[PDB]
Amino acid sequence: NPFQFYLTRVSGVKPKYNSGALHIKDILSPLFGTLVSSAQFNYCFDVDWLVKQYPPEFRKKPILLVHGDKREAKAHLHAQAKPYENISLCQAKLDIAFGTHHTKMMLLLYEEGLRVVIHTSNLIHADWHQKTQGIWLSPLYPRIADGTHKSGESPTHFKADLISYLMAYNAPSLKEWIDVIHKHDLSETNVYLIGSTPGRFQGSQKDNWGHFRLKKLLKDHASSMPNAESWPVVGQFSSVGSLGADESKWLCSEFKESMLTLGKESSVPLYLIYPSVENVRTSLEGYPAGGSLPYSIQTAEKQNWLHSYFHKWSAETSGRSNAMPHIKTYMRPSPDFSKIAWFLVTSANLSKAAWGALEKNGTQLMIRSYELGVLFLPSAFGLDSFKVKQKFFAPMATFPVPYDLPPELYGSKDRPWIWNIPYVKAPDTHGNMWVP
Numbered sequence: 115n116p117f118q119f120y121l122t123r124v125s126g127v128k129p130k131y132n133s134g135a136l137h138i139k140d141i142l143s144p145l146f147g148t149l150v151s152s153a154q155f156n157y158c159f160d161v162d163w164l165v166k167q168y169p170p171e172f173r174k175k176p177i178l179l180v181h182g183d184k185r186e187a188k189a190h191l192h193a194q195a196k197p198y199e200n201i202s203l204c205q206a207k208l209d210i211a212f213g214t215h216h217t218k219m220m221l222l223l224y225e226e227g228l229r230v231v232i233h234t235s236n237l238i239h240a241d242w243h244q245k246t247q248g249i250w251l252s253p254l255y256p257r258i259a260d261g262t263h264k265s266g267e268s269p270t271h272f273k274a275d276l277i278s279y280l281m282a283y284n285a286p287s288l289k290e291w292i293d294v295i296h297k298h299d300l301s302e303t304n305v306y307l308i309g310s311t312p313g314r315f316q317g318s319q320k321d322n323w324g325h326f327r328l329k330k331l332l333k334d335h336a337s338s339m340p341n342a343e344s345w346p347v348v349g350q351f352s353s354v355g356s357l358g359a360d361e362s363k364w365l366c367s368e369f370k371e372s373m374l375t376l377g378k379e380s381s382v383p384l385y386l387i388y389p390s391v392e393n394v395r396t397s398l399e400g401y402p403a404g405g406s407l408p409y410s411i412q413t414a415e416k417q418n419w420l421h422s423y424f425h426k427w428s429a430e431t432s433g434r435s436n437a438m439p440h441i442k443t444y445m446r447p448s449p450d451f452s453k454i455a456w457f458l459v460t461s462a463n464l465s466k467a468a469w470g471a472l473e474k475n476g477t478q479l480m481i482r483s484y485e486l487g488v489l490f491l492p493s494a495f496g497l498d499s500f501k502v503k504q505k506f507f508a509p510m511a512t513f514p515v516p517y518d519l520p521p522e523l524y525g526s527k528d529r530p531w532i533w534n535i536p537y538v539k540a541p542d543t544h545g546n547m548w549v550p
């Protein structure tokens with residue numbers, strides 16, 4: 115696998131569907147490196163559970179938790195961590211209203227080098243138990259020898275781009291990690307970093323983050339093909355924000371416009387994949403899986419137009435149709451879904467807060483949140499396109515798409531999962547209804 119894209123282990127599927135999956139205990143195992151220090155960037159943490167996922171011999175090594183909590187939530191997190199003298203915390207600034215520290219990333223410093231893990235799971239038991247989640251594992255990056263002057267940079271600019279992402283926090287604990295990264299050789303990295311950080315970006319900075327970052331990379335490092343208007347866009351996510359009163363306000367005007375960019379020189383089909391109520395009810399977790407699919411009735415009722423874009427969750431290819439998705443992915447398949455022009459795994463949901471919204475007569479991109487993902491482009495692997503792998507766990511130049519293509523449209527009786535209304539008509543796989 116050149117791609118190093120993994121799913122998390124799912125309890126309850128046959129072993130064939132976890133052969134090649136990773137649990138958090140595997141990621142932190144001594145087989146991956148002799149841990150010296152780690153940083154855990156996330157949204158939600160269960161600290162007692164998290165420490166138990168580290169090998170016993172590594173449980174006292176320094177851990178930095180990077181989070182966005184304020185006020186009582188911040189106090190609760192500090193209270194969770196206080197029994198562990200080796201745990202430090204970094205509160206990421208969220209100076210624009212309604213922002214979230216959503217990025218899920220591990221920085222793992224070893225005696226042997228450094229590893230970066232960019233993934234989709236919160237650091238709680240339920241997120242690694244019966245969900246579909248995605249992981250990108252970096253190579254083991256060796257240390258640059260003291261006295262040697264080299265950039266350690268990759269053709270995708272990943273080292274500088276990761277440092278730039280961390281610099282945006284303006285945090286002393288993260289400057290320490292910046293200095294660690296500077297000392298390592300990241301040149302083998304074949305993915306492009308796509309981050310969001312809170313702010314109002316103009317001029318040159320507009321291409322640094324969010325959907326304009328994606329657009330810039332696709333303009334510079336992808337090529338248009340004949341009949342590009344027939345290559346769909348697919349977005350797949352676990353949460354939906356307020357997108358406006360119709361598709362022209364944001365979804366099709368700026369979001370889709372960035373995602374359909376190819377090369378330097380619209381009828382494009384847009385497929386959005388989001389679990390139906392039936393997908394949740396019949397899932398391994400049952401209705402409680404919907405606690406991790408935040409879409410509120412107050413938001414949904416203002417944008418019923420959006421639901422005509424929605425397609426069911428189906429993942430026979432990876433044995434995961436009943437493992438509800440908390441992964442987020444975006445990609446550009448060919449008209450027959452046999453190839454893809456690129457693939458992105460990210461924390462970013464279908465949200466203006468995550469991807470950015472244009473302001474000031476189109477001159478400023480405003481982002482509310484921290485997000486992070488990695489983009490797989492054929493050019494970074496010496497290819498014009500990626501073949502789609504037919505079975506996720508079954509020539510290595512085929513990309514492992516973790517759900518089924520083509521996506522299947524909701525049926526007339528299907529409805530999107532909305533987390534804060536009751537479902538009391540049919541019981542779930544555990545015999546229960548949903549009463550928020």
Ligand SMILES: O=C(O)c1ccc(F)cc1C(=O)O
Pocket residue numbers: 157158214216236352353406407408463
């Ligand atoms: O899990 C998360 O970090 C998360 C936090 C807040 C949300 F509104 C949505 C999500 C999601 O990713 O589904």
